[PDB]
Design an enzyme around this catalytic site. Structure first.
Site, mmCIF file in Angstrom:
data_model
loop_
_atom_site.group_PDB
_atom_site.id
_atom_site.type_symbol
_atom_site.label_atom_id
_atom_site.label_comp_id
_atom_site.label_asym_id
_atom_site.label_seq_id
_atom_site.Cartn_x
_atom_site.Cartn_y
_atom_site.Cartn_z
ATOM 1 N N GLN B 30 29.040 39.772 42.933
ATOM 2 C CA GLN B 30 29.946 38.612 43.093
ATOM 3 C C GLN B 30 30.500 38.128 41.771
ATOM 4 O O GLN B 30 31.531 37.519 41.717
ATOM 5 C CB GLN B 30 29.255 37.489 43.872
ATOM 6 N N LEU B 38 43.318 42.584 34.702
ATOM 7 C CA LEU B 38 44.221 42.940 33.616
ATOM 8 C C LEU B 38 44.045 42.024 32.388
ATOM 9 O O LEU B 38 44.862 42.059 31.517
ATOM 10 C CB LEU B 38 45.684 42.958 34.094
ATOM 11 N N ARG B 52 38.325 41.886 39.342
ATOM 12 C CA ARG B 52 37.655 43.145 39.545
ATOM 13 C C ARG B 52 36.962 43.283 40.887
ATOM 14 O O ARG B 52 36.795 44.395 41.357
ATOM 15 C CB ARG B 52 36.638 43.339 38.433
ATOM 16 N N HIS B 98 32.017 45.976 33.787
ATOM 17 C CA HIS B 98 33.091 45.308 33.035
ATOM 18 C C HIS B 98 32.662 43.940 32.557
ATOM 19 O O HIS B 98 31.838 43.205 33.209
ATOM 20 C CB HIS B 98 34.326 45.160 33.881
ATOM 21 N N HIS B 121 32.103 50.462 29.654
ATOM 22 C CA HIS B 121 31.940 49.825 30.936
ATOM 23 C C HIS B 121 31.185 50.712 31.974
ATOM 24 O O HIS B 121 30.382 50.233 32.736
ATOM 25 C CB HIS B 121 33.287 49.291 31.465
ATOM 26 N N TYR B 254 50.225 47.239 31.008
ATOM 27 C CA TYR B 254 48.910 47.167 30.358
ATOM 28 C C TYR B 254 48.922 47.097 28.825
ATOM 29 O O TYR B 254 47.968 46.582 28.271
ATOM 30 C CB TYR B 254 48.006 48.333 30.811
ATOM 31 N N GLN B 255 49.904 47.707 28.159
ATOM 32 C CA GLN B 255 50.075 47.662 26.717
ATOM 33 C C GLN B 255 51.283 46.821 26.354
ATOM 34 O O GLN B 255 51.892 47.036 25.310
ATOM 35 C CB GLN B 255 50.297 49.055 26.150
HETATM 36 NA NA NA Z 1 46.590 43.578 27.426
#
Ligand code: NA
Ligand SMILES: Nc1ncnc2c1ncn2[C@H]1C[C@H](O)[C@@H](COP(=O)(O)OP(=O)(O)OP(=O)(O)O)O1
Ligand SMILES: Nc1ncnc2c1ncn2[C@H]1C[C@H](O)[C@@H](COP(=O)(O)OP(=O)(O)OP(=O)(O)O)O1
Ligand SMILES: Nc1ncnc2c1ncn2[C@H]1C[C@H](O)[C@@H](COP(=O)(O)OP(=O)(O)OP(=O)(O)O)O1
Ligand SMILES: Nc1ncnc2c1ncn2[C@H]1C[C@H](O)[C@@H](COP(=O)(O)OP(=O)(O)OP(=O)(O)O)O1
Ligand code: NA
Ligand code: NA
Ligand code: NA
Ligand code: NA
Ligand code: NA
Ligand code: NA
Ligand code: NA
Ligand code: NA
Ligand code: NA
Ligand code: NA
Ligand code: NA
Ligand code: NA
Ligand code: NA
Lengths: 480, 478, 478, 478
Positions: B30, B38, B52, B98, B121, B254-255
């Protein structure tokens, strides 16, 4: 500083005027990133992780779409650039006053923790906006873009909360009366805040939205109704407005008043009640506030978010033990158990002053069945939910004005009989859900017997599974 | 038994077997509700509020779809109900490890705070799963549903992290099962399929990969004496598109240059807070943000919440950490100066990263500057963009079958598909930022930056001629 | 031959058994590519170009999903592979009997051209299926896959058209199978589920019914000694929403006032062309548009193409028909005057339809008019809107089960769900149009119309006060 | 007359100015309702029932969005209401010249039936527009809304078909307007944007290009003394993705190997029918399918209907044509043998196409064959796949602006963006099919095919080792 573009999954690429950007880039607005739109609903619908922040950008955008559309179709209204910004800002800022888990905080927690005060998220938004303005030097920035802070601030706050106490508003004169129907529509509930949450909640919940707000904006016009300019809908759209409130009602049934979502909001409320004496939030001048008193100081309230849940869950202090154990029960899914649902029949209404006595009545019932355990008042939770079309018993379409194709400046009324016989006959009702705090198999069996017997004693509706959960109780009631 | 149904906006109504529900209804699982998928991307793409938790449900569901589909089409594989559950559990649990802000924590924070350790991770997920199992009495529940905890726990962990046949949780005849959750051979796995769909839904960028189509055409065939999951020959274009989409998502989202600088500022705040925040673990022992990874009970309580604990603190010892986070709220961010790449054979090695801010500050742009900037004023962020296997074409590690011989595995080379495909499969991006945000510093930073690009024979920045008109004429290549 | 996969935008990748492929690859099925799902609706909603062909694939697919789901959850029902194929075939074939413009053909054209016969698209489907089977050698192909043509053909036809247990294709212990394709008990069937999703995708109106959720909660239980498909108790709200959605789609799209008047104009063109178009059937015998329904070989060639044959003709005998279709292209349509409903007990019966244009023209408005209109200048369209079962609540014919006793069937009444539900389940709409399109005729038409509404005690038209300000004050009511 | 609103599933509620409505409500425009966007693609992707009509409304709407956006952001361009209407009209009308089955008609049929002429759908649109204007009295309606027919009609036609400043409809200071509807400089125009979104919605393949994002970043700047539409620098990635998407759509859908062979079979049926079908044009003169392009009144009646006129004919002279169409309905299609590409510098030019079936049949495989096949048994389809400008990188013809100097146009090279981009921008695909469908013919066809690929140094077919195991060992490369 120039137009920022932001990409939103509901509305696409949205332009933000630099004054909006200045309002958004403050601790008071950014706070909304840490308040879930749907509170405990995230614990039922795992897609519903969205926060008030993104909903607020969307309301600001849609407020701007409607006022721009009215201005382009009807230049004679004299909608100025200043009006547009004030309407966008009001749209952006109408959610500022929400607390942890949104409706949980002002719907459950505050009424129980501070029964003497009358607090709404609306009033909180006005107070939070004032604090946002004064703490961040926004007034000189408003002047730079042609706003008149005195009048426009008043206008913005009035759009959120209504008259700050014969034309009752001070931020704009009567010839701009239509502008007060965009962000928060007190006359009938048709406003851009619903439009954003319909689309946004649906995208995240995984339930598909049937209301078309863009279609509505295209057919919208301003006409004179009883000597005041108002936003009117095209006559043909009347079906779609009835569908809009029907959708609102479906979303409440499927999602917002989900029986487990509500019990999780209740458990969180109970944890916050037990924690209230021991969590300290620093406000103005270093003064300390509690979860329940942070609403009296906007600097403290700024720091009051969903984080409180985790601060309680991660605590080690023995004084927070009871609070922490309730939250641990949520993680293990050891929730208070749903027993069932009923409604009152006839014209019988259950008033807010009778709520506290209902757990007592369920426990006082005498089901003629052999029971292993006996349950008490404190073992039951009774949750009463008022479902309506936004205006208690009234049909909100009776407060909508329409125009026809052949005379677009002439406002008319349309009655329910002129549309359809398949529409609802009433516009309000109540649901009563009963839960049991004792979760073992024998307690739950007993809880169902008390529950069904109580429904029979009170002449409430037969619960849908009445014959399965209490086969020995439902034969005594002839009408079942 | 008693299936729960859950409504997920990406996959619809998903059925969860009661053992999965028992794994899900723990503090250790949980916890994933409080870790954004992200990270700092939410501070750029306001729809990207997903965590997540929901991503993990989706990976578990898709792992189950692929293994069920292979079992129905090919009974001869002997996929048992036990295999299906183990594959679903590994799917569910591969994200357990994570940390706060997902890739920020293992990509930036841990390498700086604990440079000597080798943390991923993945390893965290294995350790968090073990703690989940032992703290919640899951082993008797596994036995109730026909699992053998010794072998199956080993299987589950091996599916997440990897290991003559080197695996112990299943024999060689079930080798294909190791390709579903985390595919070490080529990167084609169900974790990507869920995040393509989910990240796209939330970011407002539309996904072009069809994972359902892929599952329908998937088969197990013998390749060099080992059973592997193979794709239909015709689908080879769609696999090249799948990695193309992964690369687009990295470039667009993401970048994202501001998303990355927000992750960097949060990392810096966590570095300055690390000495002063305490997290209680097993036996009352205290850990820091950087040491919570050594005790799963502490790490359980390490989530995005740490950001708010720092932001809302009043302790004077957390002042510097708190001020960095306040800068994020006011959007007084470290400023983007630009982007360049190396040319030729030149690769930039990980040991040279620290020295790059020094080289930018040492450049001598022939322009009159009112400020002089130092090494500490520059951040240089080197990003390796590839198709998941360094310089290798991952489609060279995919096996295919034809319609006329469905048990016969073949190879398809890049030349047999198209001339319009990439010639290389890896590259580096170099972003430079400036910690001094005023207009004069930023002007100066651009001159140093462009001059450095010229000195190093890096590519001409896209806006080179606009941001440094006096610098770009010296370089004949440009 | 093995499974074909077909990509459908509504349902994704659908698998077709080779027997289904054999049925699909015939002139009798492929014909459905040339019949628009929504007829004249395409002339109002430009996205609504979809044809009956793809809708039928979708019905076949969903019929298969529901029967497979019941079989997996409840092995004790003994659903065989044979049952699955027969249900999928019936799903595929229930639209075979549609004519040009779908509901236009059996709802308007046939009743006017052949008033003495009673034709439905259902009966047509059965006849077209028989012709499909016999013309294409499908019976030996059925036997190859384990079907018993005698019983199974009977089963398939009974699923489409209906009939102490009255069915012969399956015994009473498979009674639930007759509720999948065409549900005579309450109207909840897979044909609706496909058209909700498909029509919405094409029309640009978003669907809020979740058929997958429904399939997941569906179970078979004993109800009055017969096995039936039951819904989970909690889903009862969603079933009320499902019929509410059907009603919205009818109001917004299928009974759109201009869509209907275009269907009417096309019907009129087909009536004027009927004497002169010849369709060759079995033996070389000639049929008309109105008699092609009596010979399946002729009917095979009767599609939307008839519209273009008329439009592109040069024959002087088709002139009047061709001119009506030309009016549609120029958008010189019969004009909408307005809409009203009956009040009280008043129901307008099918035998009174012809007399309604006469009554509107007979009204005496009491305002001075420049032109006078006659019966032939008016069209009056009566539309019956209901929840699929005349005046009855279809939810009263649905069986439910509870979580605590999943084999025990129960009933749920309207008062147990909500007070906000409809009080009636049927009503009528009356739309009036004028064939004379000029400004004076249209003004006059509105005066006659509103006066007629007043004379008949019908509801006040929505725009009554604007279109006839001198007529609406005379009504003590309005 | 005022704005109509039309509901389109791709763009939502679109506003149409009354002049556009007058152009749309003509037989010349409404004809596009009977021409499928994707031709034979509907026979593979059953969702692809959409017609050119709705695509055209969408191009008209998007043309208006881009020109309005440029006008609002940059008042100094002096975009007038007249310019907006002319750009919308050109957008609406650029598809008027399409023939039956769209690209089938000008890509396959016309080149074979009329090899002496050079016909394009573009030239057809200009001719159809002229006829639309003159037959429907549109010029006085243009004047009513402020258009100057002489100049504006020239402008509209120039936007569709093209021409020291060569254009007459607008002067050089409005040069940017010629880049909206049909962009000859780089291919980036609103026609692509609509079909990406619309084809994807119908095909069931998801679109990843965001045209709205592009419109928001677009600006007009001076480039070599001409005003042009420029994109923001950092959008350059997205433009590469846009052409990558176009190429994916061609590979997956528009050049589907079965879609193309159905287009080929329809073309062959139309060639065999050409002598015997008559289409009446101006003055009662008769035209054929191949000559209808010379008379706009005949061409108005030339649509997909021709397929059904052939299929339903009884005339013995149309027998061969009708039989080919019957084979499509039964799915007895010409069979796919395989695909190859040329290597090296080798390009296959249009004048060598006819000789290719001969070369395949002339190959000498050296394995025992039961049947021998001839030239007429083979179809060879050569497909040119590129980024819209033959061998050229279309991004080299795009102008960009930077954030710090938005009026300053710049260029960006491929090396400034990424090393993972394509190295070439054009290629050819060669598909071979066999008209003889039996098992022995198909085996033989594969041997000839693979041997031919080896003889010509073409690429190894993907399934080469499976379909011709005895042939692929001779070739050392493979
Ligand atoms: Na980022
Ligand atoms: N390629 C993309 N496609 C879709 N959305 C994107 C893409 N790139 C960024 N976004 C999103 C992230 C933000 O919500 C919004 C604006 O991002 P972006 O245009 O990157 O602005 P930026 O502020 O970083 O750049 P700049 O300041 O240089 O104009 O669009
Ligand atoms: N009407 C609805 N439409 C779509 N989704 C729904 C609806 N009702 C609930 N959901 C969502 C919330 C959950 O993610 C999932 C399961 O909810 P639901 O069926 O209400 O489960 P439950 O656990 O509350 O019921 P029970 O335990 O009585 O079977 O479906
Ligand atoms: N890449 C793709 N993505 C999505 N849909 C596709 C793609 N390629 C084809 N389709 C669609 C078209 C069809 O509806 C369905 C099947 O086509 P496809 O797999 O090409 O089968 P096929 O019958 O042509 O090949 P084969 O007979 O060799 O298996 O999928
Ligand atoms: N309720 C609805 N929701 C969505 N789309 C609709 C709805 N009603 C109609 N449509 C579609 C069909 C057309 O494409 C477009 C406009 O239709 P509509 O508003 O009905 O125009 P109309 O021309 O029939 O009315 P009028 O001339 O009376 O304004 O919207
Ligand atoms: Na989520
Ligand atoms: Na308001
Ligand atoms: Na009016
Ligand atoms: Na794995
Ligand atoms: Na793909
Ligand atoms: Na990459
Ligand atoms: Na921020
Ligand atoms: Na490359
Ligand atoms: Na129940
Ligand atoms: Na379709
Ligand atoms: Na067009
Ligand atoms: Na066109
Ligand atoms: Na320039």
């Amino acid at each position: 500083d120039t137009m920022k573009v932001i990409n939103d999954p509901i509305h696409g690429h949205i332009e933000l005027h630099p004054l909006l950007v200045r309002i958004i880039d403050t601790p008071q607005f950014q706070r909304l990133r840490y308040i879930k739109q749907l509170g405990g609903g995230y614990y039922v619908f795992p897609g519903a992780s969205h926060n008030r922040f993104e909903h607020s950008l969307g309301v600001g955008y849609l407020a701007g779409c409607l006022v721009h559309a009215l201005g382009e179709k009807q230049p004679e209204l004299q909608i100025s650039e200043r009006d547009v910004l004030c309407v966008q800002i009001a749209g952006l800022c109408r959610n500022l006053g929400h607390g942890p888990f949104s409706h949980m905080f002002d719907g459950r927690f505050i009424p129980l923790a501070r029964p003497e005060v009358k607090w709404t998220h609306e009033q909180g938004s006005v107070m939070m906006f004032e604090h946002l303005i004064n703490s961040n030097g926004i007034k000189p920035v408003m002047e730079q873009y042609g706003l008149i802070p005195e009048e426009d601030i008043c206008f913005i706050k009035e759009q959120i909360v209504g008259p700050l106490e014969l034309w009752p508003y001070k931020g704009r004169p009567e010839n701009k009366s239509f502008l007060y129907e965009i962000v928060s529509n007190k006359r009938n509930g048709i406003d851009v805040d619903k439009w954003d949450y319909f689309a946004r909640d649906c995208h995240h919940l995984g339930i598909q939205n049937n209301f078309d707000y863009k279609r509505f904006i295209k057919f919208a016009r301003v006409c004179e109704v009883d000597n005041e300019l108002r936003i009117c809908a095209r006559d043909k759209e009347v079906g779609n407005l009835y569908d809009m409130f029907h959708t609102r009602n479906s979303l409440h049934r499927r999602a917002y008043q989900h029986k487990v979502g509500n019990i999780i909001d209740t458990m969180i409320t109970d944890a916050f009640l037990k924690a209230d004496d021991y969590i300290e939030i620093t406000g103005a001048g270093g003064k300390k506030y509690r979860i329940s008193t942070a609403i009296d100081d906007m600097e403290a309230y700024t720091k009051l978010t969903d984080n409180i849940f985790l601060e309680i869950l991660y605590s080690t202090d023995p004084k927070l033990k009871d609070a922490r154990e309730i939250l641990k029960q949520i993680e293990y899914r050891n929730l208070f158990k749903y027993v069932g649902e009923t409604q009152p029949t006839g014209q019988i209404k259950i008033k807010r002053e009778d709520y506290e006595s209902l757990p007592k009545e369920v426990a006082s019932a005498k089901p003629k069945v052999l029971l292993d355990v006996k349950l008490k008042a404190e073992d039951f939770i009774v949750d009463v939910i008022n479902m309506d079309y936004g205006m208690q018993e009234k049909n909100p379409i009776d407060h909508v004005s329409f125009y026809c194709k052949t005379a677009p400046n002439r406002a008319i009324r349309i009655t329910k009989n002129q549309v359809s016989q398949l529409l609802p006959e009433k516009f309000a009702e109540q649901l009563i859900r009963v839960y049991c705090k004792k979760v073992d198999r024998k307690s739950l069996y007993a809880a169902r017997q008390y529950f069904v017997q109580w429904c029979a004693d009170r002449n409430f509706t037969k619960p849908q599974d009445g014959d399965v959960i209490a086969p020995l109780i439902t034969p005594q009631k002839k009408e079942w």
